[PDB]
Design a protein around this ligand. Structure first.
Ligand SMILES: COC(=O)N[C@H](C(=O)N[C@@H](Cc1ccccc1)C[C@H](O)[C@H](Cc1ccccc1)NC(=O)O[C@H]1CO[C@H]2OCC[C@H]21)C1CCCC1
Lengths: 99, 99
């Protein structure tokens, strides 16, 4: 589909057997989700944003379905105020900017 | 044009008569540019992202040309790590997400 930018581009995602709302973010290199207790091994990581860095847990080869489009990649988990879908997964669903 | 997201969606912008690189950012409500001199009055403002808040200078009704498309709106100037074009101007140039 096509998503205008009058409002935040929020969509429903399915991850780890749960449905959530997440922000399609062309300005994010990575995907960062609110605190959730995903299973499996993880690695510590620091991600920097506009106001500084936060600590996150890096999960690899995680499946996320975005508007029925499936994508598998690295998912970071930490105290982010908003679930963010970054380019690492947006590319996998064929997402583009158009103007 | 149509822009894929395998690399950062960086484009050339023209503001105050000067050329710059900026990130087309659907995950940003506002547009924030690195420290620079801009004509016109400004008022202090705070914006928050991942990591916390930063203090910025808010310039209203600023002309800015984004990839050959003219926009006139609010431009924030402050210690952002990258020049970011947010939704307030992406809507003006008719930018949409598509997948
Ligand atoms: C109302 O609140 C906003 O509108 N605040 C906006 C905002 O910071 N939006 C955030 C989401 C969000 C929204 C609300 C609260 C918390 C977080 C996403 C945005 O695209 C940033 C842009 C960026 C790019 C490079 C460096 C720094 C920042 N990307 C990001 O931080 O990505 C990170 C994960 O992956 C990494 O790659 C790139 C950086 C890493 C600001 C307002 C105008 C400018 C941005």
């Amino acid at each position: 589909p096509q998503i205008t930018l009058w409002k935040r581009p929020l969509v429903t995602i399915k991850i780890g057997g749960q449905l959530k709302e997440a922000l399609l973010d062309t300005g994010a290199d990575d995907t960062v989700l609110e605190e959730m207790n995903l299973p499996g091994r993880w690695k510590p990581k620091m991600i920097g944003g506009i106001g500084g860095f936060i600590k996150v847990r890096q999960y690899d080869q995680i499946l996320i379905e975005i508007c029925g489009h499936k994508a598998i990649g690295t998912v970071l988990v930490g105290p982010t105020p908003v679930n963010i879908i970054g380019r690492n997964l947006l590319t996998q669903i064929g997402c583009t900017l158009n103007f």
